Symmetry: D2
């Protein structure tokens, strides 16, 4: 940068290039930033748009000519043309047509399916068939064989969230093909063993790295958030903040996050609730499941409508405001920040 | 023992007594036994008897003259006149009369209440009122204020299980008095936050030493064991052994045992099921909740009838045989053996 | 207690005896004490005495007539004639004569050896020979084969601390006989792999329930306490309290206590140091390794001299005062209180 | 990819671009690879070269014109012009001149200093001054204030290893400036409290996310590897493989890795030792501290000489061969792979 630009210097630099050495002193860029400054940028996708483009994708791309991958990837404008919503996460709308199937495969990358629209599709996870409907969270944890069948003439839309960008950058990717029955049970084996509150099968005493619950069904989510707002009505502690009910989807063998790499939550805000501004390390994505409100990011307010999705990159100040009762599904890379002692939180309140 | 019995020896022994020294060589007894040989002995209490003596206790002992402690302690014949069912555990039948109450207190010793007969009594745990009915497990973990009220003209019987003998021998006992409302909610606050499968309130992210679930209600227990036998019907893994469904009551923040000192389980055996003989370190107590069968202990078969209770001391070989569908509530000191690396298991199968 | 003493009552009580039921209401004793009130009592043993009785035991009890168990057990006056220093722990002076040996055995009960006087005895733990000298702590953890040989014509005295009383009361005891070489290496294999600060063999990546270090040698203990007093001289944080250096013997795979059931520590107090009074749950034993001071227990001061030993039962208020530089080896049942969430501390300071 | 290229398609694609959607079906690249296929490539840097360019950097770049950052970054040829040795790690040669200093700063990114050449430089970590010499490992864990002073007229070379590339990609970076004494103690406070084998200060009972040992000095490393080869001579288990001694630098409060994000090890291979080929997930860097041998990567053998450094990206098959006694310092991103359940190992042996 500032050494004397002499012949002997330029010879040194020439030698550098040759030996693949880069010297610190010529480096100008933001080495060790004061706080995180992501290349990802806050962004909002409108459901009215995504749904439109999804339905058209249904007409224009059949099985045999791309229909197998009929998946609308959400790309952050800041991430150089990659189909990545944040630096750690991949989120896409999977638009599954009438009677459509996918064979089984397995990969190291962890993944979930959040059903936004439809019913009567089964994702068959290690042979265990897990039914899908609006508001269910399905897990297909890393190295679990998974495939699916649509048992109906209606299509389905779901959010596919994966840890692809993390796994790509970090070199951890593995993949295998599997290989019929097409069973359609109302509840999977996993749910039948693990979905009884406070009870654990004697046959499942070993803890697991990922939840053995195949589906976190809408019924239960909805009940939990209602009780929290009800307890608040009654003077009882329940909500994380006034008007703000919320649960964390957990692995019951452990009480921890669903998968090693991804946290999932569900938030219910009472009409007129306005959350305190947060800065949190790493990235998160919300989908507005029901109701109307707005989000503030970097001081910019965006009005939000049913089905809209948005991303908050690392350290971006954010808050939500409910106009009506505001329901949002949430996911993030937080289990990574926390496993590695990188997590840090600033709340405007405290 | 074998030193030469001389004047100088007897002088040494005299000096020993004076200095409170006991020399190893004169010690004869079973110092370090080959395997555990408990002073507690296997034993069975008949419900037809206990109920009889309980009902009479109701007539003969009113409030003001012992009725406050109307509690039939189960004493092991081997434990020198102590009201202790095993060396680690206290189990008693509490016979609560019409409209009877108890003020709040708190103690370090951990405790549970398993309802055998009745309904409509509330145990109010740290202010949170927890309703009681047949087949519910209630926890009153150590240092939680607890008291109760019977909201009815009918009596109630429950098993009171505590870690009293452990806590007495080990010197850990603490106790405080509390000090009205008498609320009668259908479900407690604890249940309302924690009894939704796979979901955890954002307001309860901290793990706990004991379960925050106040009641493990019968409904859920019954469903879990039915699904396990059903999965077995269907070729699916579920049961711990052929015909033998079983759950472990767990603390959901952790996936571990209900309380640091006590494990609780519930077993359902299909008619004609006969379990493999087990030797397990430490003690356990079963109550036959429903059905008919037998237990073998030390090779002795005892026929078992609805409501009967029995104890298996450390290392006693035991097995159960179901005549009808055989339901049993179970508890033990195993979390102690396991925390300290003393647990050891022998199964006749393997 | 207070029910009307009628014929029908006495019939009930008669039935109780017969069915081995004890009713709560007739129970008078201290059920659930306000704080711990141990049957064990504070006590001090004088070394000048123990040594005297130990040396005489050497003359009067040879191999063939008790010499194999030439062990002076320290019995608490409060514990009904048992050779138990507290309700959880066994502590004894082992007086090993010239050239004396013991074959290998193994037991579930955990144990340590603290060398007070002598050198050149090896305790051979799972085949690994561990040399012994004044101030060394040796572990023989549960289920490790152990035996010893005295390679010299001098005798040796050590403290044998075990978890016998706990294991007896709780029914966890197991025992086996083993079955030559008599090797005398300066340091054992364990020490050679594990006694290099901050370094862990790639061949020992698995954690262990008990420390793999066979001996915690005096050299190292002495250095650690000296540095702590030196840092204090220098204005640096180090001591737990002014004038009070102390280390905890730890299992290096874990950073935790030496064995699941026993904590060992070493304390060095600067002349004139006077510790704040503590109440701590469970029991502890100190031995005065070097120097002079006193101990206060229940408000009673006992002057203390080199080699003296004392016991503080659960919840007894205690403090030490150094006259000279005061060195003390310490052990306790605390890892038990802590594993089970029974531990509680009161310090006069705070 | 394969949908019919019609006007209506191109309109859909146009809409995609506008809404920042990327559709899966047009994606061609290696989405979910069969096994890891890093952009980083195996590479070797020669010390004779690095030292040459380092010494010249000393002449050509003084304080005031880059000398403050006189640091030769090792850039992987595969990583697009970034000064990153692997996708997760930053490794550089810091060439510190006569009497040169650096003020204190702190950052979230974790870091170590491995001294290759020189003595008598102190890195002052949170005020605690830690001396540096050949073969010492120094830690400056995340959020610890650190700076340094050279107390001599000789220069020093060290390896600076950081988790910069991980922290950059993942958005976790934080940074602060500090702000004299220039003390030169032989050992730091950290070492004085924590470098006594098997002993833990009572003032440090709390576990830590990173090791409190400031320096892992050469003496101790060297002793551990010598004992391991000696035990092998003697028929005792010690080495991880025949001829192959190795330790892992550990955090003593925990027994775990030095820092949350970086593993450090030291390997000593007996002459003629040839390791089994390994595939391991994530990246590692070795420096040849002493001796001569070779490394095989992807089947290509590179002869290796004292001070040479090399990188093995994720899943690259590798092995080392010792010609003489071969000593190597090693580091990796493995604690990340392991915290997140991404680690996987293939050894040619098994
Ligand atoms: Fe997939
Ligand atoms: Fe009570
Ligand atoms: Fe022994
Ligand atoms: Fe730095």
């Amino acid at each position: 940068m500032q050494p004397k630009d002499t012949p002997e210097l330029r010879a040194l630099y020439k030698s550098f290039e040759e030996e693949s050495i880069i010297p610190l002193w010529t480096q100008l860029g933001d080495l060790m930033p004061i706080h995180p400054k992501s290349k990802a940028v806050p962004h909002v996708w409108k459901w009215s748009t995504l749904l439109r483009l999804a339905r058209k994708s249904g007409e224009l791309v059949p099985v045999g000519r791309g229909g197998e991958r009929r998946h609308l990837g959400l790309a952050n404008p800041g991430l150089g043309g990659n189909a990545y919503i944040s630096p750690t996460m991949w989120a896409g709308i999977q638009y599954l047509g009438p009677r459509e199937t996918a064979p089984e495969h397995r990969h190291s990358q962890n993944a979930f399916r959040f059903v936004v629209e439809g019913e009567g599709v089964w994702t068959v996870v290690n042979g265990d068939p897990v039914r899908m409907s609006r508001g269910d969270l399905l897990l297909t944890p890393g190295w679990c064989f998974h495939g699916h069948m649509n048992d109906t003439d209606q299509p389905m839309a779901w959010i596919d969230g994966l840890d692809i960008p993390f796994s790509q950058q970090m070199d951890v990717g593995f993949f295998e093909f599997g290989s019929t029955d097409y069973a359609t049970p109302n509840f999977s084996r996993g749910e039948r063993l693990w979905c009884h509150p406070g009870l654990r099968p004697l046959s499942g005493l070993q803890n697991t790295v990922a939840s053995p619950i195949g589906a976190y069904r809408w019924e239960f989510t909805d009940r939990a958030l209602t009780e929290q707002l009800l307890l608040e009505d009654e003077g009882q502690p329940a909500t994380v903040a006034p008007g703000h009910a919320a649960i964390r989807y957990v692995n019951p063998t452990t009480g921890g996050d669903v998968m090693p790499t991804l946290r999932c939550e569900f938030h219910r805000l009472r009409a007129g609730t306005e959350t305190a501004t947060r800065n949190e390390v790493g990235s998160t994505v919300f989908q507005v499941f029901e109701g109307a409100g707005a989000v503030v990011m970097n001081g910019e307010t965006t009005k939000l409508e049913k089905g809209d999705m948005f991303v908050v990159p690392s350290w971006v100040p954010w808050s939500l405001q409910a106009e009506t009762q505001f329901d949002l599904f949430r996911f993030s890379d937080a289990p990574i920040m926390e496993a590695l002692s990188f997590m840090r939180t600033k709340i405007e309140g405290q």
